[PDB]
Design an enzyme around this catalytic site. Structure first.
Site, PDB file in Angstrom:
ATOM      1  N   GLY A  10       0.786  -1.268   0.010  1.00  0.00           N
ATOM      2  CA  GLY A  10      -0.045  -0.058  -0.031  1.00  0.00           C
ATOM      3  C   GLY A  10       0.872   1.223  -0.002  1.00  0.00           C
ATOM      4  O   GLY A  10       1.672   1.539   0.832  1.00  0.00           O
ATOM      5  N   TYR A  14       3.891   9.481   2.385  1.00  0.00           N
ATOM      6  CA  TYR A  14       5.294   9.780   2.175  1.00  0.00           C
ATOM      7  C   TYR A  14       5.952   8.928   1.083  1.00  0.00           C
ATOM      8  O   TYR A  14       6.874   9.189   0.477  1.00  0.00           O
ATOM      9  CB  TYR A  14       6.037   9.670   3.235  1.00  0.00           C
ATOM     10  CG  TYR A  14       5.354   8.659   4.298  1.00  0.00           C
ATOM     11  CD1 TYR A  14       5.453   7.242   4.361  1.00  0.00           C
ATOM     12  CD2 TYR A  14       4.559   9.234   5.482  1.00  0.00           C
ATOM     13  CE1 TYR A  14       4.795   6.540   5.221  1.00  0.00           C
ATOM     14  CE2 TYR A  14       4.205   8.391   6.754  1.00  0.00           C
ATOM     15  CZ  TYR A  14       4.018   6.983   6.620  1.00  0.00           C
ATOM     16  OH  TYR A  14       3.605   6.062   7.174  1.00  0.00           O
ATOM     17  N   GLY A  15       5.338   7.754   0.726  1.00  0.00           N
ATOM     18  CA  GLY A  15       5.929   6.614  -0.273  1.00  0.00           C
ATOM     19  C   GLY A  15       5.174   5.351  -0.155  1.00  0.00           C
ATOM     20  O   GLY A  15       3.835   5.684  -0.585  1.00  0.00           O
ATOM     21  N   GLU A  16       5.784   4.296  -0.191  1.00  0.00           N
ATOM     22  CA  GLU A  16       5.214   3.031  -0.217  1.00  0.00           C
ATOM     23  C   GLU A  16       5.626   1.994   0.594  1.00  0.00           C
ATOM     24  O   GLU A  16       6.555   2.070   1.111  1.00  0.00           O
ATOM     25  CB  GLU A  16       5.020   2.820  -1.837  1.00  0.00           C
ATOM     26  CG  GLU A  16       6.436   2.249  -2.357  1.00  0.00           C
ATOM     27  CD  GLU A  16       6.425   1.481  -3.839  1.00  0.00           C
ATOM     28  OE1 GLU A  16       5.748   0.567  -3.940  1.00  0.00           O
ATOM     29  OE2 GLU A  16       7.024   1.847  -4.807  1.00  0.00           O
ATOM     30  N   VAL A  17       4.868   1.042   0.625  1.00  0.00           N
ATOM     31  CA  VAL A  17       5.136   0.038   1.441  1.00  0.00           C
ATOM     32  C   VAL A  17       5.276  -1.436   0.462  1.00  0.00           C
ATOM     33  O   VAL A  17       4.318  -1.729  -0.160  1.00  0.00           O
ATOM     34  CB  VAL A  17       4.413  -0.410   2.818  1.00  0.00           C
ATOM     35  CG1 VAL A  17       5.026  -1.348   3.696  1.00  0.00           C
ATOM     36  CG2 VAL A  17       4.261   0.763   3.432  1.00  0.00           C
ATOM     37  N   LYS A  32       8.954   0.113   4.478  1.00  0.00           N
ATOM     38  CA  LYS A  32       8.653   1.481   3.997  1.00  0.00           C
ATOM     39  C   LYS A  32       9.608   1.980   3.515  1.00  0.00           C
ATOM     40  O   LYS A  32      10.738   2.010   3.860  1.00  0.00           O
ATOM     41  CB  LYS A  32       8.286   2.026   5.560  1.00  0.00           C
ATOM     42  CG  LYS A  32       7.353   3.260   5.442  1.00  0.00           C
ATOM     43  CD  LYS A  32       7.503   4.279   6.442  1.00  0.00           C
ATOM     44  CE  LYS A  32       6.623   4.572   7.456  1.00  0.00           C
ATOM     45  NZ  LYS A  32       6.448   5.742   8.233  1.00  0.00           N
ATOM     46  N   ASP A 119      -0.752   9.086  17.434  1.00  0.00           N
ATOM     47  CA  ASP A 119      -1.869   8.890  16.372  1.00  0.00           C
ATOM     48  C   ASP A 119      -2.291   7.400  15.998  1.00  0.00           C
ATOM     49  O   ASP A 119      -2.459   6.932  14.872  1.00  0.00           O
ATOM     50  CB  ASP A 119      -1.055   9.403  14.920  1.00  0.00           C
ATOM     51  CG  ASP A 119      -2.147   9.551  13.595  1.00  0.00           C
ATOM     52  OD1 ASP A 119      -1.589   9.440  12.585  1.00  0.00           O
ATOM     53  OD2 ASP A 119      -3.087   9.836  13.843  1.00  0.00           O
TER      54      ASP A 119
HETATM   55  O1  LIG Z   1       4.788  -0.478  10.003  1.00  0.00           O
HETATM   56  C1  LIG Z   1       3.408   0.300   9.232  1.00  0.00           C
HETATM   57  C2  LIG Z   1       3.913  -0.020   7.591  1.00  0.00           C
HETATM   58  N1  LIG Z   1       2.986  -0.928   6.909  1.00  0.00           N
HETATM   59  C3  LIG Z   1       2.833  -2.047   7.083  1.00  0.00           C
HETATM   60  N2  LIG Z   1       3.916  -2.665   8.030  1.00  0.00           N
HETATM   61  C4  LIG Z   1       3.872  -4.008   8.234  1.00  0.00           C
HETATM   62  N3  LIG Z   1       3.064  -4.818   7.701  1.00  0.00           N
HETATM   63  C5  LIG Z   1       2.189  -4.323   6.925  1.00  0.00           C
HETATM   64  N4  LIG Z   1       1.392  -5.154   6.125  1.00  0.00           N
HETATM   65  C6  LIG Z   1       0.427  -4.307   5.695  1.00  0.00           C
HETATM   66  C7  LIG Z   1      -0.623  -4.768   4.703  1.00  0.00           C
HETATM   67  C8  LIG Z   1      -0.939  -6.084   4.899  1.00  0.00           C
HETATM   68  C9  LIG Z   1      -1.919  -6.492   4.103  1.00  0.00           C
HETATM   69  C10 LIG Z   1      -2.796  -5.526   3.296  1.00  0.00           C
HETATM   70  C11 LIG Z   1      -2.168  -4.300   2.855  1.00  0.00           C
HETATM   71  C12 LIG Z   1      -1.031  -3.783   3.820  1.00  0.00           C
HETATM   72  C13 LIG Z   1       1.043  -2.971   5.642  1.00  0.00           C
HETATM   73  C14 LIG Z   1       0.472  -1.784   5.122  1.00  0.00           C
HETATM   74  C15 LIG Z   1       1.168  -1.211   4.185  1.00  0.00           C
HETATM   75  C16 LIG Z   1       0.957   0.114   3.578  1.00  0.00           C
HETATM   76  C17 LIG Z   1      -0.251   0.418   4.155  1.00  0.00           C
HETATM   77  C18 LIG Z   1      -1.357  -0.050   4.923  1.00  0.00           C
HETATM   78  C19 LIG Z   1      -0.801  -1.286   5.578  1.00  0.00           C
HETATM   79  C20 LIG Z   1       2.229  -2.914   6.477  1.00  0.00           C
END
Ligand SMILES: OCCNc1ncnc2[nH]c(-c3ccccc3)c(-c3ccccc3)c12
Length: 263
Positions: A10, A14-17, A32, A119
Site C-alpha cells: 500500500g 510519504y511513499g510506499e510499502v 517502508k 496517532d
Molecule cells: O509498519 C507500518 C507500515 N505498513 C505495514 N507494516 C507492516 N506490515 C504491513 N502489512 C500491511 C498490509 C497487509 C495486508 C494488506 C495491506 C497492507 C501494511 C500496510 C502497508 C501499507 C499501507 C497499509 C498497511 C504493513
C-alpha cells in the site's frame, strides 16, 4: 542479507510499502520507503530501535542507500484493523474486547518506556497471521519521559476524529491522556462502525450531544451498557478527571468473559 521487492502492499502518503521476500530463506518483511527536512524519518528510526513488544511492529534494520531510506519491519499479513470494521455495524463484541486488550498491552508498553504514539487509529493498528494486533507507524511518535521526568507536549498532531479535546484547547498538555482518548475513539468505532464526531470542539454538534449525555443518538445507541460505561470514563473532557490505563484494567467490561479460546 539483501531482499527482493515482490509486490506493493500500500502507498501510504510519504511513499510506499512493499512485501520484501528473500529468495533464500523466504523470510517475509514489510519495507517502508520514504523519500528524503529529514527529522521526521530519523526520529522514527531511533524510536523504532527502542521498541520490543508482542503488540508493536518489530524493527529489524535500515539502509540509507543514497537518498532512499528503507525501514525494514515486521510483516503483518492480516492488514489494517480498519478493514475488520464493517461500516454502521462494527464487529462482534468479543472480537472488539480482544483487540482492545492487545491495544492496551501495547500502549502500556510504550508509555512505560516513555514513548507516546500520538496517532492511534484503526489504520495504524495492523493484524498479523493469527489476528494479533500490532501498533505501527511511529513517524509522529515522541519521547514524553526521559530520566524519570515527564515533559508536556505542545505540538498539535494526529487525526481530528481521534484527537483529544485538550490539544485543541490548551497550549500544553500531558501525553498519556491523549493516547487513552484515541483508544476510546477506536473502541467506539469497533463497537458501532462509525466515528462519533469530526472533532471534539464546542462548535461540533455531535460532541456537545455527548457532553449532555444524550446516549439515545448514534453511535451510542448501538453499543451496550457495559462498554458504554467504559466509554463514559475515557471520553471525559478534562484530562485530569479522565480514566488512566491502570483503572481501565479494573473496568467491568474490560474484565467481562466474552470470547472463547483458539480455533
Ligand atoms: O509498519 C507500518 C507500515 N505498513 C505495514 N507494516 C507492516 N506490515 C504491513 N502489512 C500491511 C498490509 C497487509 C495486508 C494488506 C495491506 C497492507 C501494511 C500496510 C502497508 C501499507 C499501507 C497499509 C498497511 C504493513
Amino acid at each position: 542479507e539483501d531482499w527482493d521487492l515482490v509486490q506493493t502492499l500500500g502507498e501510504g502518503a510519504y511513499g510506499e510499502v512493499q512485501l520484501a521476500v528473500n529468495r533464500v530463506t523466504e523470510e517475509a518483511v514489510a519495507v517502508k520507503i520514504v523519500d528524503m527536512c529529514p527529522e521526521n524519518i530519523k526520529k522514527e528510526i531511533c524510536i523504532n530501535k527502542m521498541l520490543n513488544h508482542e503488540n508493536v511492529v518489530k524493527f529489524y534494520g535500515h539502509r540509507r542507500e543514497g537518498n532512499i531510506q528503507y525501514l525494514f519491519l515486521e510483516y503483518c499479513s492480516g492488514g489494517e484493523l480498519f478493514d475488520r470494521i464493517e461500516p454502521d455495524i462494527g464487529m462482534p463484541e468479543p472480537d472488539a474486547q480482544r483487540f482492545f486488550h492487545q491495544l492496551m498491552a501495547g500502549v502500556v508498553y510504550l508509555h512505560g518506556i516513555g514513548i507516546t504514539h500520538r496517532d492511534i487509529k484503526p489504520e495504524n493498528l495492523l493484524l498479523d497471521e493469527r489476528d494479533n494486533l500490532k501498533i505501527s507507524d511511529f513517524g509522529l511518535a515522541t519521547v514524553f519521559r526521559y530520566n524519570n521526568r515527564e515533559r508536556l507536549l505542545n505540538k498539535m498532531c494526529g487525526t481530528l476524529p481521534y484527537v483529544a479535546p485538550e490539544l485543541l484547547k490548551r497550549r500544553e498538555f500531558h501525553a498519556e491522556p491523549v493516547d487513552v482518548w484515541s483508544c476510546g475513539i477506536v473502541l467506539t468505532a469497533m463497537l458501532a462502525g462509525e466515528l462519533p464526531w469530526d472533532q471534539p470542539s464546542d462548535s461540533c454538534q455531535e460532541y456537545s450531544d455527548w457532553k449532555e449525555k444524550k446516549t439515545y443518538l448514534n453511535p451510542w445507541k448501538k453499543i451496550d451498557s457495559a462498554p458504554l460505561a467504559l466509554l463514559h470514563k475515557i471520553l471525559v473532557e478534562n484530562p485530569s478527571a479522565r480514566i488512566t490505563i491502570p483503572d481501565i484494567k479494573k473496568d467491568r467490561w474490560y474484565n467481562k468473559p466474552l470470547k472463547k479460546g483458539a480455533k
